[PDB]
Design a protein around this ligand. Structure first.
Ligand SMILES: *C(=O)[C@@H](NC(=O)c1ccccc1-c1ccccc1C(=O)O)[C@@H]1N[C@@H](C(=O)O)C(C)(C)S1
Length: 252
């Protein structure tokens, strides 16, 4: 909307390292950002592109889940929601959900039902405290889905790291419940947590995301891949993230 709604220009006062992951990105365009907790350092492929703000799409379900937990819309004993019989094109959406199944299968209606219960003033307060991108709530409907609210790839990392790692307003039990819903892979070497997002505009992919974090025995890393062109889907952003993280030594 405004002059600053499409970019993040705040300096990184940290140590940062330029990466070249162009061979992994291939015919896709976008950026990758990682932050290491132990190093207090950022690692960025395509820094210019990492500061452009895009709709977060389904990655904002991270924040809707945290808000839903914070406001006691869902909890640790019961995060179940019944299906209202509206037919969806995916069978995984046509059934009862809890936080885990909704996050895993990116069930939009579950998060929409959460958002409907959240008053605009609370969201505005939270996006301000979190420094969430352009903080633009617009019409306040599905404002995170190809709409007013935009965030950069660099901000996806900073905002998620700060939300989880600072001693703040969100409880440890909420943070733990969200983490459980985001767990993708666990083995002897690492735990990988994350969430995809895919935007579709006029039948074409236009905006792919995979935002998450890795816990190893030595460190914790927050990361995000954004795709703006080529085949810009969440699925592809996840594949790219895994290839990059592997090369960097984060996954062993
Ligand atoms: C998350 O971003 C999300 N996005 C969408 O569903 C979406 C966004 C914009 C336009 C269309 C759609 C969409 C996708 C699938 C089916 C129907 C529709 C629609 O509204 O017509 C949900 N998350 C994605 C992810 O990558 O995790 C998803 C593709 C699983 S769907």
């Amino acid at each position: 909307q405004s002059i600053t709604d499409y970019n993040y220009k705040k300096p990184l006062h940290n140590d940062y390292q330029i990466l070249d992951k162009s061979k992994i990105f291939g015919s896709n365009s976008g950026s990758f950002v990682m932050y290491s907790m132990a190093a207090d350092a950022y690692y960025i492929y395509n820094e210019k592109e990492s500061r452009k703000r895009y709709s977060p799409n389904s990655t904002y379900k991270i924040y809707l889940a945290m808000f839903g937990l914070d406001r006691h819309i869902i909890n640790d004993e019961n995060s179940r929601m019944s299906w209202n019989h509206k037919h969806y094109p995916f069978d995984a959406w046509n059934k009862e959900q809890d936080l885990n199944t909704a996050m895993q299968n990116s069930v939009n209606w579950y998060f929409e039902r959460i958002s409907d219960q959240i008053p605009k003033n609370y969201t505005a307060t939270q996006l301000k405290q979190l420094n969430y991108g352009n903080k633009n709530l617009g019409s306040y409907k599905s404002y995170w889905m190809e709409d007013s609210l935009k965030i950069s790839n660099l901000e996806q990392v900073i905002v998620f790291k700060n939300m989880m790692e600072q001693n703040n307003h969100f409880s440890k039990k909420a943070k733990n419940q969200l983490s459980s819903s985001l767990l993708i892979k666990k083995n002897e070497k690492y735990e990988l947590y994350g969430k995809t997002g895919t935007g579709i505009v006029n039948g074409k992919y236009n905006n792919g995301w995979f935002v998450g974090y890795v816990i190893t025995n030595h460190d914790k890393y927050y990361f995000a891949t954004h795709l703006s062109d080529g085949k810009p889907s969440g699925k592809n952003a996840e594949l790219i993230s895994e290839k990059i993280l592997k090369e960097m030594g984060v996954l062993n």
